[PDB]
Structure formats: structure tokens, C-alpha cells
A and B are shown apart, each in its own frame.
Chain A
Amino acid sequence: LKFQCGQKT
């Protein structure tokens, strides 16, 4: 989607 620092999915 967009970057969300620190998030692994």
C-alpha cells in the first residue's frame, strides 16, 4: 500500500 516502518506482513 504505502510504507509503514518496522512492519513485516
Chain B
Amino acid sequence: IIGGEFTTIENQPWFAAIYRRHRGGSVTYVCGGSLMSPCWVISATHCFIDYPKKEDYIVYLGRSRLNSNTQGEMKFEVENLILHKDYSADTLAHHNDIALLKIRSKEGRCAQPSRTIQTICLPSMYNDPQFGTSCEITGFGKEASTDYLYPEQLKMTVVKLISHRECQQPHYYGSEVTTKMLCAADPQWKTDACQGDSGGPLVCSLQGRMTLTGIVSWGRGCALKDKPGVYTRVSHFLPWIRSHTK
């Protein structure tokens, strides 16, 4: 996250941190995710596409720091990894960039509710906030495009949803953005999501509930004028989510 504030997981208790195990001993961060129900975390297919070996990933809930432990955290193995058939990447965009991870602890259980572990709500079919709505994004991604390391402390920021007409202007992203995506930016192009924030949540209050409106997917640069962050439009994937979460 470029800009934003440092925060703790109590402020984003549905945030899930996904890591990958390496032969040699290191575990590295992959992407963020969101807890939708006790056993399911939703993220982005591009986070796994290149290495779809579920056994090598670790999911943690209740984590405020990247490589140190947080009291209350829960560790899970990925029982199922569901990628979107029809996911496609082009020169910038990722299409149908949504994935589901079914989690299981070493004791055979799913997540348990706590002050640091909570689920986020799903929107109703094709229902979105209107542009102009402020939503929050959270993640362990870069703090500056030139950094080569991720922050140790979780960050969060606020961005506003913008219209498809504005995002699809030739000097923004043109037709690269589809109706299955959402764009959000800071009015002053000061804060934004960046590499490392992929898979994480775009949360907005919708009909009184804090709702998972988008999944951080792509963007050209980070906090660049006329280059908003693009997110997978969750409201348009409800049938797909239901199909695998029944």
C-alpha cells in the first residue's frame, strides 16, 4: 500500500495472509485474501497460476505482521485450491481473477471466530456501491514502487470507487477494463494498492454491511495519475462462488 496507515488485524479481521514454502527453509509471502466463511478464503487466481501446487501454501488468519508472529494467529493448510477456468492475462489485465482456497488446520478444523478473526460479507447478486463511495484496502504490499521488500506491519488505506466511463477513458485503461472489474483511486493519486497487495480485499459498506466489493487484481504502477487500481467485481461472480461454496 502506498501511503495509508499502519494498522493491526483487529481492524481487518477477515484479512488472510498466504505464503509459499521453499525447499531450503524459507517461506515467502504470496498474496492477501479474505475469509468468506469458516473454511473458505477468496483471493486472485494470478497469485497461484504459476505454481498451482496446493501443498506448498500456508494461510494464516489473525496476523498483524508479515514474518513475526501475532498472538491469536491461526495457521492452515490449503485443502482445495479452486482457480477460475477462463482466467486470462493480457498486457495489463487479468480476467476472471478470483480463486477460492478451502483451509484446514493440522487438527482438521477451519477458522474459529475471535477478535482478530472474522468473516467479511459477500454482496448480493450484481449489487455494488455507487461510484464516489470510500472503501478500504489492506495488505502487506510495497510502500513504494521501487521497494524490493514488503513492510513487516499490515497497512490499510482508503480509496474511492470511480465509474467505468472514467476508467475506460483512453488515457486511463481504455477497453482493458471490463464490466467484471471495478476501479478505485485516491482523488489526489496519493495512496493506492501496489505489488504484494494482490488478492486482498476492497471493502465498502453496502446496505449497512462491510462488504467484500472487490479483490485487488492489477494496476499500472502504483499511485500514478490516471492509472486507478483495478479489482475483480465480486458481485458479478456470486454464481461462481456459490458453485464452489455450497
Contact = CB atoms under 8 A, between A and B. Distances in A.
A8 B211 contact: no
B110 to A, nearest CB: 10
B113 A1 contact: yes
Interface in A1-9: 1-9
Nearest to A5: B121
B10 A5 contact: no
B113 A3 contact: yes
Contacts of B122: 5
B245 to A, nearest CB: 13
Contacts of B205: 6
B209 interface: yes
B113 A8 contact: no
Q: Is the interface of A mostly helix, strand, loop or mixed?
A: loop
Contacts of A1: 113
Contacts of B10: 8-9
A7 to B, nearest CB: 6
B13 interface: yes
B69 interface: no
A2 to B, nearest CB: 6
B236 to A, nearest CB: 19
Contact of A6 (B11, B37, B38, B211): B211
B64 interface: no
A7 B205 CA distance: 11
B119 A3 contact: yes
Nearest to A6: B210
B120 A6 contact: yes
A1 B118 CA distance: 10
Contact of A8 (B37, B118, B121, B209): B118
B209 A5 contact: yes
Given A3-B38, A3-B119, 18 more contacts: A1-B113, A2-B113, A3-B113, A3-B118, A5-B14, A5-B118, A5-B120, A5-B121, A5-B122, A5-B210, A6-B120, A6-B121, A6-B205, A6-B210, A8-B11, A8-B12, A8-B118, A9-B118
Nearest 7 pairs of A and B residues by beta carbon? A6-B210, A5-B121, A6-B209, A6-B121, A5-B119, A3-B119, A3-B113
21 contacts: A1-B113, A3-B37, A3-B119, A5-B14, A5-B118, A5-B121, A5-B122, A5-B209, A6-B120, A6-B121, A6-B205, A6-B210, A6-B211, A7-B210, A8-B10, A8-B11, A8-B118, A8-B210, A9-B10, A9-B13, A9-B118
